[PDB]
Amino acid sequence: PISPIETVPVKLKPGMDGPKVKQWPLTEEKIKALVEICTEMEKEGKISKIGPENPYNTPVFAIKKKDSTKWRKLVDFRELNKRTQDFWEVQLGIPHPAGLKKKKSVTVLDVGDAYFSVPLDEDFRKYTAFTIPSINNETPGIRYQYNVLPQGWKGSPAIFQSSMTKILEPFKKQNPDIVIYQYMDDLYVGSDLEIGQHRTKIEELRQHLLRWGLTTPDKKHQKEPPFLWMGYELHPDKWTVQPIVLPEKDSWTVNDIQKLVGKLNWASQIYPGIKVRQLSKLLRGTKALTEVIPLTEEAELELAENREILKEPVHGVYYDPSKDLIAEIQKQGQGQWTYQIYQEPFKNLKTGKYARMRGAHTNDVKQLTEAVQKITTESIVIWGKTPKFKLPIQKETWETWWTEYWQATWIPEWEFVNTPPLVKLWYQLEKEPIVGAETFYVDGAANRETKLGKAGYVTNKGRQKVVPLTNTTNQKTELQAIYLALQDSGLEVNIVTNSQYALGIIQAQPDKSESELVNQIIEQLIKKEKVYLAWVPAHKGIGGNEQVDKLVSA
């Protein structure tokens, strides 16, 4: 045979042999287009005949190339991949057009039979053994071994990406001012050279790739904008995603909403204000992917206004390293947030959203902090720097939060923007007891077996209450005891509890909770003007805690 470029040594997991599984009963309609190109591979040295000396076998099928009449060859290596050594992928992420700098001339080109242009390792070729079917079951079919990277192997992508870089390294060093975005076999080549000199250096690279046996077909070659790259439409000074089609189904299943959710998450990168909360509330706890489920009036409203955003076309701009990065966040309600990253006002680089519900109890300040951290990581990935933040939270509101919180928290260089709705703290626990306010000694208890319990309080003025509770836990009675003292007290109240569980939840100042009992406590805390929470150990003969501990245990 002939050796084109430098190979990569491959092994198996130690103490294991090759794949020995039988083929699929493939239909003869695909066998016609299969043996066609398969026989053409031997002439080019891509595939070779093997004798019965090779005791391996793996299934083979084929699917059509999307938006094309040509067919793609796939080989099922699932059993081979389970026994093949592990790699470390050199693909760390996906390039985004918002990180592209403006270039005077741009060229995009695809690599014909990419995987099939890289030689496999010599000693490993035997394990790619597979048989080819026929029109009838009489003829056996030639068995082959791969001389190149096959489509369907778990090691083909990583070896191709690394080998492509070693070929492009000499050219990148000879042409330092040329930007080459390498992603699998698609290459984005841009420069500030004149369009005349640009296409000369392009042909210099096409010859450089051809020097190592890499084809650059003209049909895949793109010389004029708008360039179709990574599912985007790259214009000389703007970019946008390729058009997005939303399903027009009258009756929606689970797979329909899932397709709709993913389409909206993809659109949220440039189309501002996409929300998927109410559409995602339909896919919770569902069993069958084919199950039909009706649309709520909330999700019906959400899908309507989301379609109006996709109605008018939007676009993004390119990155200017000389100007600062600005990120502005807006609150959308129900734990939903959106943001726009821009350098010039009203000219967005990209958009996005953060709507993850982290924890059982939280507030708007925590979720804004989590959104800033999501934007920071996203911005460092795309541009390598942290943007300047414009946050809908008062400077003194944030100061009060992070200084009083028991956990360390921080937000980078930011300024306040007066765009409602503003993020605020809905109540503030007093640091010292309140003079003249009634002091409620609360406690609760529940039986592990009976699930019944009591919750009550005793005050310094003689006030008292005990309430029987059904199908409750020890923690719920302690929260319930706090709910009672908030209900039966004035605008200012001192509360003494022994529950570490309840005190830890309330001191973090949440404004939302999965527990409906906690939401009612929050509702009461907002109504109050001064609340003081204190903790004491139980069974120590302390204050009214000993007296109320006796009441809730009888």
Added chain:
Amino acid sequence: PIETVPVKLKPGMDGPKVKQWPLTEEKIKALVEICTEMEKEGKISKIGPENPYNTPVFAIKKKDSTKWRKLVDFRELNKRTQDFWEVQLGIPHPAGLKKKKSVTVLDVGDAYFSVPLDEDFRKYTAFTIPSINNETPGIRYQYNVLPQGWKGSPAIFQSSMTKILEPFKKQNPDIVIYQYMDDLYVGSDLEIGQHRTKIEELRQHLLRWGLTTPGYELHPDKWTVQPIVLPEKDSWTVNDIQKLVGKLNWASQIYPGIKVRQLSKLLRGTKALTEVIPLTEEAELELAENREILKEPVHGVYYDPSKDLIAEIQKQGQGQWTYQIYQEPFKNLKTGKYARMRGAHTNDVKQLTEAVQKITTESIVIWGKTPKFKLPIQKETWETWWTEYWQATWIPEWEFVNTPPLVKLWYQ
């Protein structure tokens, strides 16, 4: 052209497979420039994806360094080479290092590039350099010499190090020298002027053996512990005594002599929190005896070299931070408090990073170990900013906790 010491992982253990986290532009530019010159000098060489192992890498600037310094997160690799740098080529720890009036740290990491590395172990030193906006896939490398930040590196170089130090250890007999990874700790009871002079002598003593030094000044004798203190009030409210009894109840897990029976008697009623409560005779005496027990050292606390060190940190607000170092719960080996550090009153993450660095430095001087930290911070908040403020050549183990302050035990 030097013999390579063979290195093997712990029995039944695979190499490190840790993902590379995104890097800023200034750190990627610095790493590309550093890795380029390290390749033309043969210290590293590019590899491919057939290596299934990987270790994170980023860049730092030491305190007032202004020059970038490469740093690899070998924490995962060191846990898988623990058999090497502890049992085999371990280093005894000088108990007198913490007693010197001044200790200086020097970065001797550049000398490890002289000794080659075992060929069978270079497959575990793999690291990947990312690209901005994923313009280029990962460029992977491997170390051909002793890597900076690997715990097996100072153990191999120890034989070469003690020969370079032997002339100066004889010219100055009573000066203590300790080596922890890429750092060299040298302490003396000499005056500040004499101490800094002998450092330069050690710098020139290392220059003629082929090593540069791109110095931190410590004072271990100045370090003070933080004890549990009770307030001084001319009048006590119900809430004051309630917080006090709860604090003494929690403190009873450390000092068993704490009693609360005479302070709980003052709370037997159902009184308002702001109501003033006069102290009885037995309560004043029970409080007086409790203040004395907190003056005593904890009974039966001593360091165990076979146990790991645990470090807890509490944010006290207004720039104050408290910490405790222990091996067993409630058997603290040291307690302390930091204040007015960099980033105070403006940046919580910078203060915590500075606190972790100061605590780890103290643990290396006193015991020669790095503790595992329980950080009062969320995972996503810490993993986003901690690299922007890290100024040390080592990285300790850490986990994240969320313990609300039900009782302010360590600071008033």
Added chain:
DNA sequence: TACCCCCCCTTCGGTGCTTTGCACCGAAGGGGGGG
């Protein structure tokens, strides 16, 4: 009835402290997207 990478949204099951209830997180399956 193929492989590899990134993203969000949900479930579920393991973990440890708030404790045998409750809260958290990481793996996993659903989808979108890239080659």
